Design a protein around this nucleic acid. Structure first.
Lengths: 129, 129, 129, 129, 129, 129
RNA sequence: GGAUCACC
RNA sequence: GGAUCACC
RNA sequence: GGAUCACC
RNA sequence: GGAUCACC
């Protein structure tokens, strides 16, 4: 194995899927960027550290760009009009079994499943009510 | 709509699924917890607010219990040995349309989809290699 | 080659052997862990660097769990009562050829071979007498 | 018994084996040197101490010399062109059974077995990748 | 997936090829060293950093040794009589798409292609004329 | 005889090839520029000097432009939206025979050969991982 | 807390 | 700029 | 961390 | 070290 592989970040149903691929592991921060100019690329980073004697902490960041073409000095440059940033930190005790861990993964997957409260709020520029 | 409803957090395939239900709404912060003692419950909370003039930020927090060797209803100390804490912060610029937001949700669903690098590392008590 | 692969750490003769597999590579430090919670796992890490102008140094670290009376997946405290820590540092002058290095490995295999003074003392909770 | 016996440090297959024999136990540091001039001898030292109220710590050092004959002042002297130093410290809790200890020994033996990642890297002047 | 693997630095037909293998990835500086004595080995290092707001900057270094034996007072050591040091810094704006980077790469390969002015001047201890 | 001639810097099959032609050899600095507007042209410079008593030092520089049109107030000019700058310095002791220099050259060609770590990282807007 | 996001 | 080459 | 390796 | 790249 090697879990450092590419994957589809945005599954747009076979066409216009956004796949992100490995691009750097300097300083122990695993990085993946979409196949774009670095100014318009999607980026995902992940790093794990023993945040304490008894915890391990994963730090995952995702940047979703809104691409544009800005005219600077009379010249057109590929640019990102804005960026949406996701920052997540997961602290897991060292006493967690592989099954305990799989439980955390499933909880995170269910949280964002289509139709559930949270992804429905975000997608509608609303809050939970 | 009205999205503060009960949902399935851990899908164990119809049998032994973990449902989380509304439990508090003080301060506009929606809270959902599982049917357990608060020390052993699955807890999810979510709130939105405008972090700055240019952004809106969602703060989602999840607590997952260490289930292996757990004594249901018992007093388990130290608390930090028996719980995992997830903390997500999603920053979205005020220009993001509903469409932009749906894509942001897709990017999040993709990152955690089964079989991708990140969920596989977490689930296997691993980092990236 | 490509040597960051899974291997058998504890050979219990084909049955109940302990295999340790790649789990992290942040900072060029290869890590291998067994299939357990991180508190009960067998862990091995290895890195090389040039310690000085004249030497290269390998830093190998191993953690072995106290298995007698262990509760698989349980929370066992204090951590220091349930784990043994091995720490090896191998310093090799830049003049050592591959041949010189093979002999150095043989010297290490010899020291720990079954039946010699050192492994026998360790295994019997003894010193030298 | 008396585990303070001689042993073959480098098994060169019956011919040119490097056997190391007991040579000193002053100050509680057990020593073994190869049958050479003290300037060209292989040396192994071992000492155990109750590093703490609840630990015991073994300190093992091995020196592998690269022998030469240096001409000092117009005279030839048996000398070591350089030395490779191995330093290992093993900390074992006092709660470790003899079987727990045997497990540590096997882990150390498997680590260095021919063909496994670590001894393969060292022997090839390479790192783990 | 990884690009931190071994590769043929010098292709001398299929035999007498110089293969450089990964050795250390400390502080975002990837290092590859050829086998045998570290003293006579080839070395390649590479690192990338964001040199400024719009630029990323690669720093590649290569050392080619002149393999020789040093005899001093009758003790001979494997040394490098001397070394050539190559230091290249490639600056690339963040507006470069992957297509642009492939072009930057073909330009570098062309500069050094056999028969072109530059590699011919170097191979002949000459300058431009 | 001269090595100050034109050459294909970028080989795009046999068409869309970038040819750089001699332009100026002032002060021991050879310069080659591609055709058309000097503003959108490629540039290669090379010079050799005796950096020290035992060394000679080559300084090669290459600029790859991003061809674009600048419109300002209705007046459009042929410009380069931006440029990548390559700066390489090759140091070679005066003891190097022609054979040694040919080896230094094959090492440079190999570093950048297609598929090897370095040219692959660059062509993909990536680092080492 | 916050960001322009491995940063303050 | 120079190096003994991730230093100066 | 480091060594010339029971040392700093 | 940085560059707008034989400059700083």
């Amino acid at each position: 194995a090697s879990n450092f592989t590419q994957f589809v970040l945005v599954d747009n149903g076979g066409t216009g899927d956004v796949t992100v691929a490995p691009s750097n592991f300097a300083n122990g921060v695993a990085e993946w960027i979409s196949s774009n100019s670095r100014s318009q690329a999607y980026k995902v980073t992940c790093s794990v550290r023993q945040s304490s004697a008894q915890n391990r902490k994963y730090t995952i960041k995702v940047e979703v760009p809104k691409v544009a073409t800005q005219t600077v000095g009379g010249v057109e440059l590929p640019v990102a009009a804005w960026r949406s940033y996701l920052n997540m930190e997961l602290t897991i005790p060292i006493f967690a079994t592989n099954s305990d861990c799989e439980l955390i993964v499933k909880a995170m997957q269910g949280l964002l499943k289509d139709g559930n409260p949270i992804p429905s709020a975000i997608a509608a520029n609303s809050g939970i009510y």
